[PDB]
Every structure is written in C-alpha cells, then in structure tokens.
PDB file of C-alpha atoms and ligand atoms in Angstrom:
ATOM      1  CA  UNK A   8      -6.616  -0.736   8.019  1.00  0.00           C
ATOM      2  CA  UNK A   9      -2.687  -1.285   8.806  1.00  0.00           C
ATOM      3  CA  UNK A  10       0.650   0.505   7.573  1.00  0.00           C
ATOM      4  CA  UNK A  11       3.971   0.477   7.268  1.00  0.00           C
ATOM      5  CA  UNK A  12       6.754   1.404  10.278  1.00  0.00           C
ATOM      6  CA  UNK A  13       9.945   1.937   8.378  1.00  0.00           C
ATOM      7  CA  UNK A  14      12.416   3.956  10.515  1.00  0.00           C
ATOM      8  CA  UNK A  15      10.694   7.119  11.515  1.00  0.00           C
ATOM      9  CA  UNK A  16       8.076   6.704   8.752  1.00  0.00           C
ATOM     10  CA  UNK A  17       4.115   5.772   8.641  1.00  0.00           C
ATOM     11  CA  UNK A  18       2.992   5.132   5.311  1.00  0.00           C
ATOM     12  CA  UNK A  19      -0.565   4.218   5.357  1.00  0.00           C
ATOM     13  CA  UNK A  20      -3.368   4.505   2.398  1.00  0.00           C
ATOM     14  CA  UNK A  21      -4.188   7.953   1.491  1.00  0.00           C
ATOM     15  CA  UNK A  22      -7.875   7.331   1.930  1.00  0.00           C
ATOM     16  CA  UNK A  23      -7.223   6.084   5.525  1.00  0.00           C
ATOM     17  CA  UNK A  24      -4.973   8.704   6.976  1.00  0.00           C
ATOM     18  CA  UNK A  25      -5.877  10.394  10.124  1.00  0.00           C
ATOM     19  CA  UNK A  26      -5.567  14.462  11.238  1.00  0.00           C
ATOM     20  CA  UNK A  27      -2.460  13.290  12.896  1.00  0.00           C
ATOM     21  CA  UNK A  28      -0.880  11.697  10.003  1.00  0.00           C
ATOM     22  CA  UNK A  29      -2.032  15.174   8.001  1.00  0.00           C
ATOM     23  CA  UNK A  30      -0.346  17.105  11.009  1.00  0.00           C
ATOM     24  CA  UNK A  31       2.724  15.371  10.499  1.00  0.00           C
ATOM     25  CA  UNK A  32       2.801  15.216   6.682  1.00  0.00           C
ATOM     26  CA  UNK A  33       6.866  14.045   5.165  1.00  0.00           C
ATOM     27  CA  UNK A  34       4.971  13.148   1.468  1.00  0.00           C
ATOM     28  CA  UNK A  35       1.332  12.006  -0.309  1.00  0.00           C
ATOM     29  CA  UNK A  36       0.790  11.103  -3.535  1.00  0.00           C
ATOM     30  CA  UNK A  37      -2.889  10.917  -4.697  1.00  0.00           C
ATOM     31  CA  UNK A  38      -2.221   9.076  -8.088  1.00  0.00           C
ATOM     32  CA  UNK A  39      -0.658   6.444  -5.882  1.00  0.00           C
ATOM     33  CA  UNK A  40      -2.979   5.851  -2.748  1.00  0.00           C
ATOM     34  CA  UNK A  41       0.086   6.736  -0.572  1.00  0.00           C
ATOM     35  CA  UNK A  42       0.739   8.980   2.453  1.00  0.00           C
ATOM     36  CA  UNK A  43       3.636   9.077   4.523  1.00  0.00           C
ATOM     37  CA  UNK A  44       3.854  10.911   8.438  1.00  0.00           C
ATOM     38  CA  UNK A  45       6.701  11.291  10.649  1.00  0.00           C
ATOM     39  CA  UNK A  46       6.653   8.886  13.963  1.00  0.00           C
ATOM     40  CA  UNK A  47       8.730   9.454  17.461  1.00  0.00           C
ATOM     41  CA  UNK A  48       9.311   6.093  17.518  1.00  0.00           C
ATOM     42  CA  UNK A  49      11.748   4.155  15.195  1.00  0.00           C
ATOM     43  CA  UNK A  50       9.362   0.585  13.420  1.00  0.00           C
ATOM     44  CA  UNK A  51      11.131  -2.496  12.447  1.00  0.00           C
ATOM     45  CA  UNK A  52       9.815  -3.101   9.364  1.00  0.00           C
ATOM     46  CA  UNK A  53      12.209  -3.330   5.789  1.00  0.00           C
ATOM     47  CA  UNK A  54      11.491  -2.439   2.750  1.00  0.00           C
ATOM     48  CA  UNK A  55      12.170  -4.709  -0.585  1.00  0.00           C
ATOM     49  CA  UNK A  56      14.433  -3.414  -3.074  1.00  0.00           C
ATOM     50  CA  UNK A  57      13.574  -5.580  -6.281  1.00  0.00           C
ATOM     51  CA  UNK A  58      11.193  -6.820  -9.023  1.00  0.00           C
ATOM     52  CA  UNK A  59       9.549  -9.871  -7.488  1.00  0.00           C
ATOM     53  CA  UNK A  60       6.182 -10.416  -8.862  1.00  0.00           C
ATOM     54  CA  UNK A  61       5.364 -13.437  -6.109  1.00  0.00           C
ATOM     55  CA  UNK A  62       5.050 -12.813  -2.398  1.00  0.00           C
ATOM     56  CA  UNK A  63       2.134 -13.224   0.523  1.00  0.00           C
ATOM     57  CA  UNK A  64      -0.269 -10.580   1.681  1.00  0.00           C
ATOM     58  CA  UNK A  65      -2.386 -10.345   4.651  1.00  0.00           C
ATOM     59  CA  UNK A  66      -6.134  -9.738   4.417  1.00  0.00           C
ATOM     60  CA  UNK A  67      -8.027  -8.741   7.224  1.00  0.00           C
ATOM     61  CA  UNK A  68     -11.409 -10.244   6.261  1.00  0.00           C
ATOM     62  CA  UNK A  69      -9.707 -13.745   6.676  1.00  0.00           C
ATOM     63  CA  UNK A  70      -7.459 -13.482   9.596  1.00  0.00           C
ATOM     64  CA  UNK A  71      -5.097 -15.293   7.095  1.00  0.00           C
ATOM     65  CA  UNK A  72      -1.902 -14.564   4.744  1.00  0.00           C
ATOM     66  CA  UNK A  73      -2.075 -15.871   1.086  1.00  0.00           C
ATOM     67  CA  UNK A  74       0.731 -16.359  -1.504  1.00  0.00           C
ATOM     68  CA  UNK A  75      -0.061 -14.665  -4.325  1.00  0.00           C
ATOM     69  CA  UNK A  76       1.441 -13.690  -8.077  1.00  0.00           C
ATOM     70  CA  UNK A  77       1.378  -9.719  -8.793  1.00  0.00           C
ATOM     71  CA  UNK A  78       1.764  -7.715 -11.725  1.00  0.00           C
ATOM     72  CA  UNK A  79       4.402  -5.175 -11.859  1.00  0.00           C
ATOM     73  CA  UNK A  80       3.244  -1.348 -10.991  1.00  0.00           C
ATOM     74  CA  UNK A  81       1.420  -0.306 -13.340  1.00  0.00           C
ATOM     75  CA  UNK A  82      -1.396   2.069 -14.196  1.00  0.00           C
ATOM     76  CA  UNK A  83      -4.856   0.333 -13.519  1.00  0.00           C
ATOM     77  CA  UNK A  84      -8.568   2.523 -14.120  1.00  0.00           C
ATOM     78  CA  UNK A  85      -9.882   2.144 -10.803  1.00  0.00           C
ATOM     79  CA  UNK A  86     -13.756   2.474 -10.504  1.00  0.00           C
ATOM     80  CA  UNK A  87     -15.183   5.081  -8.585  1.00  0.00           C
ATOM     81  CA  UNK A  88     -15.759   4.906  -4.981  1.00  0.00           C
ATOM     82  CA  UNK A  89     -16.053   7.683  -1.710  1.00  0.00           C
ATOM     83  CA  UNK A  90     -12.795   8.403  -1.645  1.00  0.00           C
ATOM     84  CA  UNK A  91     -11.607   9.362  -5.596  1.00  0.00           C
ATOM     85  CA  UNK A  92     -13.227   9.528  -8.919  1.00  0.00           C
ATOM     86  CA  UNK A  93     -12.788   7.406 -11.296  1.00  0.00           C
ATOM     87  CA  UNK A  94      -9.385   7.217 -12.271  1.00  0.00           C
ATOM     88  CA  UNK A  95      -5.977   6.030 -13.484  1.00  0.00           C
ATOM     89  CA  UNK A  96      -4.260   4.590 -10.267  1.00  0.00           C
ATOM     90  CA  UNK A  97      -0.171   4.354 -10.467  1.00  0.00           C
ATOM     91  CA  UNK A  98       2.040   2.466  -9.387  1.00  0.00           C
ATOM     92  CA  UNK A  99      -0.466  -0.509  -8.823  1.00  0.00           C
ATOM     93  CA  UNK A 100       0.238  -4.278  -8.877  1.00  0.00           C
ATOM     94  CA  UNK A 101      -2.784  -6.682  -9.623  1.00  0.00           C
ATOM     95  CA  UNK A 102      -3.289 -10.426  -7.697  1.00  0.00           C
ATOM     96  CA  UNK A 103      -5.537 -12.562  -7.502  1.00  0.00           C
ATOM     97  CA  UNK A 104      -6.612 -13.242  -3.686  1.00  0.00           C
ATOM     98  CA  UNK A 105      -9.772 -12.656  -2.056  1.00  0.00           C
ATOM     99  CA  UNK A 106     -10.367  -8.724  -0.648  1.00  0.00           C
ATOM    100  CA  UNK A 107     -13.092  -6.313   0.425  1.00  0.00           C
ATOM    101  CA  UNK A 108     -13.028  -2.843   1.245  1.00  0.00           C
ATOM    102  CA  UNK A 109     -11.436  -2.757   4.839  1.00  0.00           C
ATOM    103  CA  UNK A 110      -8.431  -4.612   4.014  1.00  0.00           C
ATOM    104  CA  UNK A 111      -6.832  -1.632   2.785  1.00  0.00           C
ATOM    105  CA  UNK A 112      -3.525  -1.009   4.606  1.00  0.00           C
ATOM    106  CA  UNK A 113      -2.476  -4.765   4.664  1.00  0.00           C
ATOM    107  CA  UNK A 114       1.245  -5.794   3.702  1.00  0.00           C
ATOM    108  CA  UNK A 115       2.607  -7.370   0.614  1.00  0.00           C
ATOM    109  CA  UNK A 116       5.828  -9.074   1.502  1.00  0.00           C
ATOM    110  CA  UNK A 117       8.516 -10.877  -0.365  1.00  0.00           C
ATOM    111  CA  UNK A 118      11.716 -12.440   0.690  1.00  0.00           C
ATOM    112  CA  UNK A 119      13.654  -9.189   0.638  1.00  0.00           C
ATOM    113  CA  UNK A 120      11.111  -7.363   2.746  1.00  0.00           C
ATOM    114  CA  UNK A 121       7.732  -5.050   2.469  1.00  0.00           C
ATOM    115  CA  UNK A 122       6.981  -4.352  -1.029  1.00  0.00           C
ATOM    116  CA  UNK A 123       3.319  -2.492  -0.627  1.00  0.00           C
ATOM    117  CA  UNK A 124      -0.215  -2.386   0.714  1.00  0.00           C
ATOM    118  CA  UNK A 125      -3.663  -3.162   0.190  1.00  0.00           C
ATOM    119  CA  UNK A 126      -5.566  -0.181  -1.663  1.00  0.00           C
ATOM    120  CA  UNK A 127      -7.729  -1.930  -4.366  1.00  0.00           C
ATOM    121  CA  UNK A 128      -9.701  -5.157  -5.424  1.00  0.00           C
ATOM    122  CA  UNK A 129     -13.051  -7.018  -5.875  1.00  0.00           C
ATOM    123  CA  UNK A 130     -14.448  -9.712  -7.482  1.00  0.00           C
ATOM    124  CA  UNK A 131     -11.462 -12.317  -6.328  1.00  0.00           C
ATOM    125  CA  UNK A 132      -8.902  -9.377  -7.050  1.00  0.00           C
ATOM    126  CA  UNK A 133      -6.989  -7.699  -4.990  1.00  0.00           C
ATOM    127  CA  UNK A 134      -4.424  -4.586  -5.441  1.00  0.00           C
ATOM    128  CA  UNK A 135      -1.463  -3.459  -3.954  1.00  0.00           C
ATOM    129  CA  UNK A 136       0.390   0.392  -3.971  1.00  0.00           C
ATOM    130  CA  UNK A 137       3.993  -0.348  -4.751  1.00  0.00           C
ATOM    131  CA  UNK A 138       6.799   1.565  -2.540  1.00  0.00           C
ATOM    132  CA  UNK A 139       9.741  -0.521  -3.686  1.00  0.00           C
ATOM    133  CA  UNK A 140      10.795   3.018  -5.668  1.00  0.00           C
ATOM    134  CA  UNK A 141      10.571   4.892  -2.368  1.00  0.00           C
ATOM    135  CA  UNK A 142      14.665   4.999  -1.847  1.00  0.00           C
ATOM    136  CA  UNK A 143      14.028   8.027   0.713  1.00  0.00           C
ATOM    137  CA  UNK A 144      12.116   5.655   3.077  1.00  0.00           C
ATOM    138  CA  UNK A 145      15.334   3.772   3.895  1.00  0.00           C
ATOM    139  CA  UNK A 146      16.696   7.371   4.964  1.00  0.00           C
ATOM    140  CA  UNK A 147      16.780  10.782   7.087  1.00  0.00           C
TER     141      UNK A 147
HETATM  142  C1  LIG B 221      -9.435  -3.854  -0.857  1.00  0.00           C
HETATM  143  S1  LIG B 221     -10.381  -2.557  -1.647  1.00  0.00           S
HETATM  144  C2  LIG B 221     -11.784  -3.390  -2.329  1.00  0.00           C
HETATM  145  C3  LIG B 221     -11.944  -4.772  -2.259  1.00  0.00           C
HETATM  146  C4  LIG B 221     -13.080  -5.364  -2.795  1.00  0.00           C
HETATM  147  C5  LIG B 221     -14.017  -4.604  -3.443  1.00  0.00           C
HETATM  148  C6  LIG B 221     -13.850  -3.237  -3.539  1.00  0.00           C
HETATM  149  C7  LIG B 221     -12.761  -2.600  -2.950  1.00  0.00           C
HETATM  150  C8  LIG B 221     -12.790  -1.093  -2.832  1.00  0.00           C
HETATM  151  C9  LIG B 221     -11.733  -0.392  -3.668  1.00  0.00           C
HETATM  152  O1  LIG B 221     -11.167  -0.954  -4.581  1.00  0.00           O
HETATM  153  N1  LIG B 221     -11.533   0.916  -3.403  1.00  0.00           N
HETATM  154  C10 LIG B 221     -12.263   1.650  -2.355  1.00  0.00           C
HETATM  155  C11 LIG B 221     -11.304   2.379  -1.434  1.00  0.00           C
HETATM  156  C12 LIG B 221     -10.357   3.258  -2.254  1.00  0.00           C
HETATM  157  C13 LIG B 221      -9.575   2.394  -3.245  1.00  0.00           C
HETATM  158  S2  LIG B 221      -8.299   3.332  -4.066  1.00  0.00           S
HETATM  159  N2  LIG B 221      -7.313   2.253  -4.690  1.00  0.00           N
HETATM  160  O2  LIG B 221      -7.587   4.039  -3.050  1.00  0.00           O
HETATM  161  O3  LIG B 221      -8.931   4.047  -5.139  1.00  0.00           O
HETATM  162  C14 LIG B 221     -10.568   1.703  -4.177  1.00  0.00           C
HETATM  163 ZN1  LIG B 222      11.659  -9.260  -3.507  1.00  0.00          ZN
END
C-alpha cells in the first residue's frame, strides 16, 4: 500500500483505490496503474521533473529503502494477475530490487523529488508507474 500527497492530490495504484478515492475521482488511467482523488487537506510531497534513471524506493516487505537503477517508462507485458489481464503496461520503469505483491504504492524518489510508485515486479524485479509527465499534479 502507500501514495502520493501532492497538493490536493492522492495518487495511489489503480488496483488499490478505495470507494472514496472512486467518489472523489480528478483522473485514472488503466494502461498506467494510476488513479488520482481529490484530498481536503494540502500533502507535502514534490514531484520530479526530469529523466533520472537512478533513485531509492521503499519496499514494504523490508522495512528498508534501496538505491536502485530504472529504465525509462516504457511499455512492459505484464503477466496476468486479479486485478488486469494480461497486458501491455505504460509508462513503466524496470529495477532491480527485491518486491512482492503488497508493496504496491511505495515511492520512487530522486534528488528532484517523487518520480513514481510500486505497481509491478517478481523474481528480484521490481516496477515502478512513472508520473514525472503529470504537469497538472503541480496545479489547480
Ligand atoms: C510489487 S508487485 C509484485 C511483486 C512480486 C511478484 C509479483 C507482483 C505482482 C504484480 O506484479 N502485479 C499484481 C498486482 C497488479 C500489478 S499491475 N502492474 O498493476 O498490473 C501486477
Ligand atoms: Zn530526478
């Protein structure tokens, strides 16, 4: 679990959103993993504007932060699973770092701020859904 609190934005995995986050729908993108809801309150959290490919995530089924290397967002076939067929994911960027399913929602970070979440991995992989490209975030 985990999002992002970006002004008065939530942006949490698709999979993982809740009837409030539906109830209070600004933008989802299936393709992507990504849904964003409206908060009251205003988060602290920035978002990177930039093409690093190195940064740390946190994954909840260490308690721990890891540096890793990431590809840039691309489109990755992403095996089947409860929550979407089999399918083309966009947007995607590729590491190498441990993961299992309930670390979705966990942020990638490089020096110029939040540059995506946990949404895919296995097998010593883990994936993240870009929202560098999200300009609107930083906005209204
Ligand atoms: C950190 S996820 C993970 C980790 C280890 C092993 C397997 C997974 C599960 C995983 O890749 N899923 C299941 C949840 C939905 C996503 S997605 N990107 O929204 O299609 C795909
Ligand atoms: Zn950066």
């Amino acid at each position: 679990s985990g999002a992002i609190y970006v002004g008065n934005y939530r942006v949490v995995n698709r999979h993982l959103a809740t009837h409030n986050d539906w109830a209070n729908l600004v933008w989802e993108d299936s393709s992507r993993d990504l849904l964003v809801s409206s908060t009251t309150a205003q988060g602290c959290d920035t978002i990177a504007r930039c093409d690093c490919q190195t940064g740390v995530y946190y994954c909840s089924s260490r308690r721990k932060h890891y540096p890793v290397s990431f590809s840039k967002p691309s489109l990755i076939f992403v095996e089947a699973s409860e929550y979407y067929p089999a399918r083309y994911q966009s947007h995607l960027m590729l590491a190498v770092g441990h993961s299992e399913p309930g670390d979705c929602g966990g942020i990638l970070r490089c020096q110029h701020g939040v540059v995506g979440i946990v949404s895919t991995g296995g097998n010593g992989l883990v994936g993240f859904a870009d929202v560098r490209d999200l300009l609107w975030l930083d906005e209204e």
